[PDB]
């Protein structure tokens, strides 16, 4: 009934984690239109480092392409490819 | 090579997801402390409702207890049990 220390420390240490990201956040110049879904799942560096002076940053990145819907009012439905940045590897590095 | 629309949509939609949360955000009366690890993995609602009229919110919760290292000035390193709120169910409701 209690998660042991090493299991929590290892699971929370800096690594790529599935993160749900609003598309407007990735692409704030696109906030004029409406997307469906409005957010996408991306692998992004997350978690903590052994020390507050370190930050979890990507050391390998790639693009991932997804099928997304976009509309403008009183205007046709579109479906097309949209690309997003993913993090493939992360490490704890000085800030 | 391209993630398909229905796969993106289902994976992005409001639901409990492993989220990395800083302990200070969960224990604001202990911001005098240093924790190791400094963040914990918790199940929390995330994702989108694909209606700007709606927000993703917890509808069922529970606790989980984890072993965390704790230190503060005039104290040495301790290990102790800390409880955290988890989200078991989420739904899209008006904002």
């Amino acid at each position: 009934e209690v998660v042991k220390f090493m299991d929590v420390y290892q699971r929370s240490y800096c690594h790529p984690i599935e993160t749900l990201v609003d598309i407007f956040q990735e692409y704030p110049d696109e906030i004029e239109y409406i997307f469906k879904p409005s957010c996408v799942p991306l692998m992004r560096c997350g978690g903590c480092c052994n020390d507050e002076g370190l930050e979890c940053v990507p050391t390998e990145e790639s693009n991932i392409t997804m099928q997304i819907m976009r509309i403008k009012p009183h205007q046709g439905q579109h479906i097309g490819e949209m690309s997003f940045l993913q993090h493939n590897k992360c490490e704890c590095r000085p800030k | 090579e391209v993630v398909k629309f229905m796969d993106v949509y289902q994976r992005s939609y409001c639901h409990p997801i492993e989220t990395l949360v800083d302990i200070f955000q969960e224990y604001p009366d202990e911001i005098e402390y240093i924790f190791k690890p400094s963040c914990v993995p918790l199940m929390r609602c995330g994702g989108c409702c694909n209606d700007e009229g709606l927000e993703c919110v917890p509808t069922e919760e529970s606790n989980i207890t984890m072993q965390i290292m704790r230190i503060k000035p005039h104290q040495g390193q301790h290990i102790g049990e800390m409880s955290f709120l988890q989200h078991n169910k989420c739904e899209c409701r008006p904002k």
Binding site: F5, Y9, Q10, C14, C49, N50, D51, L54, C92 | -
Partner: peptide, 14 residues
């Protein structure tokens, strides 16, 4: 026990 890398338990007990 360099701080840039994930640790083993020995790094904490000591």
């Amino acid at each position: 026990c360099d701080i840039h890398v994930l640790w083993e338990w020995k790094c904490f007990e000591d």
